[PDB]
DNA sequence: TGAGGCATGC
């Protein structure tokens, strides 16, 4: 890439889960790897046919090493159960492997960052190594940097969520469904929350639907 | 504490 390597050439030839989780924490293909805990990889089976991906770790999970472990990560479970959407039926990893996080200076905690574009693009070798893998039926695109990651800048969540999407680019030819990512609910006012919640349900409604 | 899609800063 123009400002990081990318992870292209550390991504081993290969479709077992195991294998590359291990790689990816061998990775340096953009900064990200220094300050971070550990890589969080994806959490699911081959065996998978919905595919759900975030945006990054969060605090939680840079410490666990599994995604979708904190307040994001709890959120999400709820709006599962009400879809009915088992969870072995789930590959859910994030665009990006490795937590993005600043600190003030006279501050101990440490503050999530958004990743930058470049890291995004970076990082994706990831992503299409374990599409590859898993041949999920349905992605799911948890939030704008995943959604903007398989869809490309200009996409936006806000204009095309719940919408089933399919794409060349993209191996498989699986159905995409973008929404917000759940932290968003928590982000945003609590008298929203309860449409947001349930906003969010309706899209995995409509991600449990696709029949290939 | 835990987004999103616009903007401005260097
Ligand atoms: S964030 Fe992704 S590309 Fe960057 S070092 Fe970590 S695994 Fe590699």
């Given at each position: 890439?123009?400002?990081?390597?990318?992870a292209?050439?550390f991504?081993?030839?290969?479709?077992?889960?195991?294998?590359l989780?291990?790689?990816?924490?061998?990775?340096?293909?953009?900064?990200?790897?220094?300050?971070?805990?550990q890589?969080?990889?994806?959490?699911?089976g081959?065996?998978?046919?919905?595919?759900?991906i975030?945006?990054?770790?969060?605090?939680?999970?840079?410490?666990?090493?599994?995604?979708?472990?904190?307040?994001?990560?709890?959120?999400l479970?709820?709006?599962?159960?009400?879809?009915?959407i088992?969870?072995?039926?789930?590959?859910?990893?994030?665009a990006?492997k490795?937590?993005?996080?600043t600190?003030?200076?006279?501050?101990?905690?440490?503050?999530?960052k958004?990743?930058?574009?470049?890291?995004?693009?970076?990082?994706?070798?990831?992503?299409?190594?374990?599409?590859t893998?898993?041949?999920?039926?349905v992605?799911?695109?948890?939030?704008?940097?995943?959604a903007?990651?398989?869809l490309?800048?200009?996409?936006?969540?806000?204009?095309?969520?719940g919408?089933?999407?399919?794409?060349?680019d993209?191996?498989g030819?699986?159905?995409?469904?973008?929404?917000?990512?759940?932290?968003?609910?928590?982000?945003g006012?609590?008298?929203?929350?309860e449409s947001?919640?349930a906003?969010?349900?309706?899209d995995?409604?409509?991600?449990?639907?696709?029949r290939?």
């Amino acid at each position: 890439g123009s400002h990081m390597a990318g992870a292209q050439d550390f991504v081993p030839h290969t479709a077992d889960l195991a294998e590359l989780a291990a790689a990816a924490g061998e990775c340096r293909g953009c900064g990200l790897y220094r300050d971070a805990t550990q890589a969080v990889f994806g959490a699911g089976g081959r065996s998978a046919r919905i595919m759900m991906i975030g945006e990054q770790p969060g605090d939680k999970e840079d410490l666990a090493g599994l995604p979708f472990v904190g307040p994001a990560g709890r959120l999400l479970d709820r709006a599962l159960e009400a879809a009915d959407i088992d969870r072995d039926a789930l590959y859910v990893t994030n665009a990006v492997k490795h937590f993005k996080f600043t600190r003030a200076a006279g501050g101990k905690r440490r503050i999530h960052k958004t990743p930058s574009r470049t890291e995004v693009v970076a990082c994706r070798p990831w992503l299409i190594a374990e599409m590859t893998s898993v041949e999920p039926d349905v992605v799911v695109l948890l939030g704008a940097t995943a959604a903007k990651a398989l869809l490309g800048n200009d996409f936006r969540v806000t204009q095309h969520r719940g919408e089933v999407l399919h794409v060349d680019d993209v191996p498989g030819d699986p159905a995409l469904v973008a929404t917000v990512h759940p932290s968003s609910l928590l982000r945003g006012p609590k008298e929203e929350r309860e449409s947001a919640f349930a906003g969010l349900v309706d899209d995995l409604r409509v991600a449990a639907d696709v029949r290939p």
